[PDB]
Amino acid sequence: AHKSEVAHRFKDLGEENFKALVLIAFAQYLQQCPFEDHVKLVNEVTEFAKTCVADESAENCDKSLHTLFGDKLCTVATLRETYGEMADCCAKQEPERNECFLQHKDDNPNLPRLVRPEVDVMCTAFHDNEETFLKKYLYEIARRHPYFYAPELLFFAKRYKAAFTECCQAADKAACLLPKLDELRDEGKASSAKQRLKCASLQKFGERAFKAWAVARLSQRFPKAEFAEVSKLVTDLTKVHTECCHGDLLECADDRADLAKYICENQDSISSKLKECCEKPLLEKSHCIAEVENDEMPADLPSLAADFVESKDVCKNYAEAKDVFLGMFLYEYARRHPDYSVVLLLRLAKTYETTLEKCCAAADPHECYAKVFDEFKPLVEEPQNLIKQNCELFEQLGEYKFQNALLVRYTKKVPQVSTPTLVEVSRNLGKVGSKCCKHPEAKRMPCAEDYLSVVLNQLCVLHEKTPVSDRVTKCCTESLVNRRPCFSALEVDETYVPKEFNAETFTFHADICTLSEKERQIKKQTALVELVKHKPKATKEQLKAVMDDFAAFVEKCCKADDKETCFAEEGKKLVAASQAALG
């Protein structure tokens, strides 16, 4: 119903969420306009929306959200001066005008990173004006991260509100506040990385791959839901993911809202863990559903071998409808293993597809595919053993020394990769090792998948356009199902000749006593990468000897009376002893 859809969205979302979502909407397009302009546009759009709420038959209220939003974007006069060619969009009709506006979003806005005010200033301006504060930084976060989902930005903003409300009262407001802002910022950039990874992977591998990912992930999340329900949810879900990935905020938010509406209307045919979250306001429903735990799988489900190995009608049931039959295979195999990563379920599904395409063209098919489940055991066991031994080594070593061990191991594997890339991916692998290994084994692999795909994604981004290793290029250009086992099968580059001895490479100053712990560990790890690159044959014991020579150097030189030059005179003998100990 509703003659005015903007009136229904205002009545359904609420004035707070409406004004905030419009703030993100204008902020993502007009990244260069100041905050006051966006406040004016949001207040005017909200007031007109109130005129449509009081009466649906008011003038221009029957027009869609895209028309009013586009015209409102065209109301500004300095559009051609500031954004130039984006003002040419207003000369087009609304359907193409939304595409012009959507393409003229500056993905690289070149905006300076935020200058964080003092803690007392943020708590002061917070207590004096919470609304203008949270909407101010909501605008600053929105205009620096285009194509970021706006409701998720709202939940981020409310988590910021919780952190400020908790830490503006602590004994040490700083030690409480800064770590929480750092974790909300890391969660924001990491979530943005997962969004861009899912969208670029949708553009790179197509739609069918995402449909398989959605059947597997939803079948893990909703094991009691029937296969047809999962099919409807992956059609709607591939719709919302395609439209959200294209960048259109209206189709995105409206689509996810209606999808949450449908799911909460069909809880009984989906899951039982949706009870306490379908009572929430509409904008929070889709978020909780995105964060809801896995439903309990049905009690004693039979083995798939009866319907996918033992049945005589395998090749004809498959050949009659391949994507539907393989969809049922992926549903049944996914509902039984919530502890598996989705990419693993796609590896087993693609293995089954390959074995069926090989057997259904042979002499006796049943004799051929009678051992298809045997091919699944190593493909499952290898990542299991990987997270086992890695979570054991981290669990017995701590995050920093874990990053050092991964640093020297991966430096031995791919020495030609640049040092900042190795340090970055190794530290990120230590952080995911610190986030996912804390869970029990039945929940480690999904977390480690969702973050490992991100880390390796950044790796292939840094290696793109600046290639140094042909094997890294190979694994980065493999199929997404083979990307992880390709990297896990990296060997030690024996043909690597040791790097030059560069005097400026191993040069330190007294400022390292004043550089932050993060940057000090950055310097130690960078000197570690350059140390293993300078000597790829140096054993772990010798590398520990230079580790403790530099560690006792900065330790017994930072804490060694009033000495500014014990980094200059002793650095020479540490350099010479470093060249000798690894000769």
Curated annotation (Swiss-Prot):
<feature type="disulfide bond">
    <location>
        <begin position="277"/>
        <end position="288"/>
    </location>
</feature>
<dbReference type="GO" id="GO:0005794">
    <property type="term" value="C:Golgi apparatus"/>
</dbReference>
<feature type="glycosylation site" description="N-linked (Glc) (glycation) lysine; in vitro">
    <location>
        <position position="161"/>
    </location>
</feature>
<dbReference type="GO" id="GO:0031093">
    <property type="term" value="C:platelet alpha granule lumen"/>
</dbReference>
<feature type="disulfide bond">
    <location>
        <begin position="391"/>
        <end position="437"/>
    </location>
</feature>
<feature type="site" description="Not glycated">
    <location>
        <position position="465"/>
    </location>
</feature>
<feature type="site" description="Not glycated">
    <location>
        <position position="563"/>
    </location>
</feature>
<feature type="site" description="Not glycated">
    <location>
        <position position="388"/>
    </location>
</feature>
<feature type="modified residue" description="Phosphoserine; by FAM20C">
    <location>
        <position position="4"/>
    </location>
</feature>
<feature type="glycosylation site" description="N-linked (Glc) (glycation) lysine; in vitro">
    <location>
        <position position="322"/>
    </location>
</feature>
<feature type="binding site">
    <location>
        <position position="248"/>
    </location>
    <ligand>
        <name>Ca(2+) 1</name>
    </ligand>
</feature>
<keyword id="KW-0732">Signal</keyword>
<feature type="domain" description="Albumin 3">
    <location>
        <begin position="379"/>
        <end position="576"/>
    </location>
</feature>
<feature type="site" description="Not glycated">
    <location>
        <position position="435"/>
    </location>
</feature>
<feature type="glycosylation site" description="N-linked (GlcNAc...) asparagine; in variant Casebrook">
    <location>
        <position position="493"/>
    </location>
</feature>
<keyword id="KW-0677">Repeat</keyword>
<feature type="glycosylation site" description="N-linked (Glc) (glycation) lysine; in vitro">
    <location>
        <position position="224"/>
    </location>
</feature>
<dbReference type="GO" id="GO:0009267">
    <property type="term" value="P:cellular response to starvation"/>
</dbReference>
<feature type="binding site">
    <location>
        <position position="66"/>
    </location>
    <ligand>
        <name>Zn(2+)</name>
    </ligand>
</feature>
<feature type="site" description="Not glycated">
    <location>
        <position position="3"/>
    </location>
</feature>
<dbReference type="GO" id="GO:0072562">
    <property type="term" value="C:blood microparticle"/>
</dbReference>
<dbReference type="Pfam" id="PF00273">
    <property type="entry name" value="Serum_albumin"/>
</dbReference>
<feature type="disulfide bond">
    <location>
        <begin position="244"/>
        <end position="252"/>
    </location>
</feature>
<dbReference type="GO" id="GO:0051902">
    <property type="term" value="P:negative regulation of mitochondrial depolarization"/>
</dbReference>
<keyword id="KW-0165">Cleavage on pair of basic residues</keyword>
<feature type="disulfide bond">
    <location>
        <begin position="167"/>
        <end position="176"/>
    </location>
</feature>
<feature type="disulfide bond">
    <location>
        <begin position="513"/>
        <end position="558"/>
    </location>
</feature>
<feature type="binding site">
    <location>
        <position position="248"/>
    </location>
    <ligand>
        <name>Zn(2+)</name>
    </ligand>
</feature>
<feature type="modified residue" description="Phosphothreonine; by FAM20C">
    <location>
        <position position="82"/>
    </location>
</feature>
<feature type="glycosylation site" description="N-linked (Glc) (glycation) lysine; in vitro">
    <location>
        <position position="572"/>
    </location>
</feature>
<feature type="disulfide bond">
    <location>
        <begin position="52"/>
        <end position="61"/>
    </location>
</feature>
<dbReference type="InterPro" id="IPR014760">
    <property type="entry name" value="Serum_albumin_N"/>
</dbReference>
<feature type="site" description="Not glycated">
    <location>
        <position position="285"/>
    </location>
</feature>
<dbReference type="GO" id="GO:0051087">
    <property type="term" value="F:protein-folding chaperone binding"/>
</dbReference>
<feature type="site" description="Not glycated">
    <location>
        <position position="239"/>
    </location>
</feature>
<feature type="binding site">
    <location>
        <position position="2"/>
    </location>
    <ligand>
        <name>Cu cation</name>
    </ligand>
</feature>
<feature type="glycosylation site" description="N-linked (Glc) (glycation) lysine; in vitro">
    <location>
        <position position="443"/>
    </location>
</feature>
<feature type="disulfide bond">
    <location>
        <begin position="359"/>
        <end position="368"/>
    </location>
</feature>
<feature type="domain" description="Albumin 2">
    <location>
        <begin position="186"/>
        <end position="378"/>
    </location>
</feature>
<feature type="modified residue" description="N6-methyllysine; alternate">
    <location>
        <position position="533"/>
    </location>
</feature>
<feature type="binding site">
    <location>
        <position position="258"/>
    </location>
    <ligand>
        <name>Ca(2+) 2</name>
    </ligand>
</feature>
<feature type="binding site">
    <location>
        <position position="239"/>
    </location>
    <ligand>
        <name>(4Z,15Z)-bilirubin IXalpha</name>
    </ligand>
</feature>
